[PDB]
Amino acid sequence: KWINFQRKCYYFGKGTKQWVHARYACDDMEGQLVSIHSPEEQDFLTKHASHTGSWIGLRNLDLKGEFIWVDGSHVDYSDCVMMRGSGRWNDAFCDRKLGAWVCDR
Amino acid sequence: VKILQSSCDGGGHFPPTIQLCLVSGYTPGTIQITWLEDGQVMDVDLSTASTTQEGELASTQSELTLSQKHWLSDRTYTCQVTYQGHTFEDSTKKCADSNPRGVSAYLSRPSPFDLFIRKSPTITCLVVDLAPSKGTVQLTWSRASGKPVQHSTRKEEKQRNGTLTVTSTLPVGTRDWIEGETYQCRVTHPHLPRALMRSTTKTSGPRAAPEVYAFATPEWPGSRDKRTLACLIQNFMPEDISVQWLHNEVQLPDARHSTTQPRKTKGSGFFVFSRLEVTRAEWEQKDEFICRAVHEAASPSQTVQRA
Amino acid sequence: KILQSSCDGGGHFPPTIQLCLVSGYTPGTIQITWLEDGQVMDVDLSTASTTQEGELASTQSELTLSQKHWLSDRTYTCQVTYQGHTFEDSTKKCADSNPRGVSAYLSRPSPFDLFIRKSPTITCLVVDPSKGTVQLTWSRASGKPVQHSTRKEEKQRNGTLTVTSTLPVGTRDWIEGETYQCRVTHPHLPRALMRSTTKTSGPRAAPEVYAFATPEWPGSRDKRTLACLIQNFMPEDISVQWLHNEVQLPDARHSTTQPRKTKGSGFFVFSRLEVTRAEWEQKDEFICRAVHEAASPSQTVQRA
Ligand SMILES: *[C@@H]1O[C@H](CO)[C@@H](O[C@@H]2O[C@H](CO)[C@@H](O[C@@H]3O[C@H](CO)[C@@H](O)[C@H](O)[C@@H]3O)[C@H](O)[C@H]2NC(C)=O)[C@H](O)[C@H]1NC(C)=O
Ligand SMILES: *[C@@H]1O[C@H](CO)[C@@H](O)[C@H](O)[C@H]1NC(C)=O
């Protein structure tokens, strides 16, 4: 069911859910929220990107200030952050709902 | 997609006809809308469908008419949406009555000290009951997503004025609260006809750093050994704030220290006042009193202190 | 027709509540105003959007409310002003089939009316309607005659009648210890409801007033804040007022906290006042006056 690219498996889930509710869906389907490190990896996500927007594994802990990925790795290639239809990311509300989510394993 | 029910009149009485549902914008294509009644498909003639194209995304709205006897019979209605990926679901149910026979419940958010410094955030459900009769005050706990919860400390304190007050302290996750998780609570009583439901989450909105100001009272005729300290913490959002008093690097407990309720400023922000009484032996040993304030938008490391 | 936000599967209330929807009308300029039981709400909280469909024009307003504001049992009204008529529509939280009885509230006169204004008055606020037969009888504990009270009734938008009775009480009589009785009778109620109030007899203490000024903070230049502390006084009845150029500033400008108990016998209150650059430059003197029962001289304790 998961669409493959490079080596990592990707699932493009649909349904009106919050960032935290979309995060639980990735855990139940054995895995976690999408983490981008390579520039070529973004090109694959744009092909299956939703017009409304898809939630990405970028979040704020507030204690450090800087943004860190869901797994724990530092952000290299570029409030709960979402992904636009064009490709680029932007700052959004935590309670905000979107009809698309991306999980990776 | 979000389902919007018909509002009650001025008195609070239910209208004879109930109108529901509203579906958000999507990519143009053929859609399937099906009405459910607790896992049972309703008649297509009762609902009306209308599609409207706005810019690039397409919007559709379904309106199902229901009688007062059908809606108030305690039945959950689900709007099944079928588009590409198979199925989509959103459920709607009747609202439980508030303040039945003078019974009010209060659910407060965890203090910033427990969320950042102590790292152990807890939610307290304070329910005030004026008529203590033969029955139970069952405090059921649940999550918005459907995740399991730990057992809460259910302690009841019978007051001298003839009222019973029971509190339930639920231990919530540190990372889960900041992410945006909504914690639900259900209150039931055998004497009460309808249940009580109160739920709280992280107040998503504007963030502002608090402004701490320290003040000391001069010598007043009559008092010689005891003196009072006044503190002002203003311009901050959300209303969640922790006030601490320090002397000789050690924090002071809830005693002596008193803090007012978060009141709105003539502006955006919020303001809180702190009062502390100190003896002659305290200032002579160490003439330094630091008041610590913990906030969500506070910096550095959620710590704003003034001497 | 107003449309409220639906509850989840379990029946739990959502954190944010969204309201209102206005039907089609003849094209023209419209005015939408939000009410909270006869009180105009802030325009920033609501969002307006107009859409033209065929010949008739449709407009929709969306007001965001917290769970603590919606479940506190308060009626919201959407006032629509078009062609100089006005169309009202009210929304309320789901309630029971008319619970509890008729409640009456009798409040003591404020220290400003008792000492400064010298005209103390007692207001009897009774919350209820089947028939307009609400009687407010006045009597004294000793058996002395009383003047006629201003009986004014205000029918609320939520379907309840609220009648207030303002009785003019004596200045010297209140301090001496006179108890004023009130009788409220209704055909629906079986027993006659009676509420009476007097001067809070107990220990008396003079209030301690302290004046403080906030220094310059980065970001703010024109506006400054003034903090005042009034502590150690009994009873809880206290009047807080700010003075500038020998005249009293309006009640809307200054904010005062509820009377809280000290770690000791007494009570404490905090006062906050926001002032502009034009205020202190014209006159650099701000005095906060406190009125109390045990206050001296002549029930006036002020500090600059
Ligand atoms: C319909 O709307 C009116 C709004 O005016 C509601 O009346 C308000 O009811 C509350 C609660 O009974 C009153 O508050 C009480 O005030 C006294 C005196 O300050 C205080 O001692 C009590 O602790 C309490 O706070 C409030 O004064 C009253 N407003 C007026 C102007 O009478 C009414 O309850 C609403 N109806 C329903 C069914 O909700
Ligand atoms: C009874 O005492 C409790 C103490 O917590 C208080 O909250 C409550 O309002 C009091 N009830 C009355 C009727 O004064």
Author numbering:
A (entry chain E): 166 to 243, 258 to 284
B (entry chain A): 234 to 540
C (entry chain B): 235 to 362, 365 to 540
Give the text the authors published on this PDB structure.
The antibody immunoglobulin E (IgE) plays a central role in allergic disease mechanisms. For reasons poorly understood, IgE recognizes seemingly innocuous substances known as allergens via its Fab regions, whilst its effector functions are controlled through interactions of the Fc region with two principal cell surface receptors, FcεRI and CD23 (also known as FcεRII). The second receptor for IgE, CD23, is unique among Ig receptors in that it belongs to the C-type lectin-like superfamily. The interaction of CD23 with IgE is involved in regulating many allergic processes.
Here we present the crystal structure of derCD23 in complex with the complete IgE-Fc region, including the Cε2 domains, which in the free molecule fold back onto the Fcε3-4 region in an asymmetrical fashion. The crystal structure contains two essentially identical complexes of derCD23/IgE-Fc within the asymmetric unit. Each complex consists of one IgE-Fc molecule bound to one molecule of derCD23. The derCD23 molecule interacts with the IgE-Fc chain onto which the Cε2 domains are folded back. The derCD23 molecule binds principally to the Cε3 domain with lesser interactions with Cε4 and the short Cε3-Cε4 linker region. Despite the close approach of derCD23 to the Cε2 domain in the same heavy chain, just a single hydrogen bond is observed between His216 of derCD23 and Thr260 of Cε2. However, the experimentally determined complex shows that upon binding of a single derCD23 molecule, the disulfide-linked (Cε2)2 domain pair move as a rigid unit, swinging out 16° to accommodate the derCD23 molecule. Examination of the Cε3-Cε4 interdomain angles of IgE-Fc in complex with derCD23 presented here reveals that the chain bound to derCD23 adopts a closed conformation. In contrast, the free IgE-Fc chain unexpectedly adopts a very open conformation; indeed, the Cε3-Cε4 interdomain angles of the two chains differ by 16°. Regarding glycosylation, two sites on the surface of IgE-Fc (asparagine residues 265 and 371) have been shown to be glycosylated, and were mutated to glutamine in the construct used in this study to facilitate crystallization.
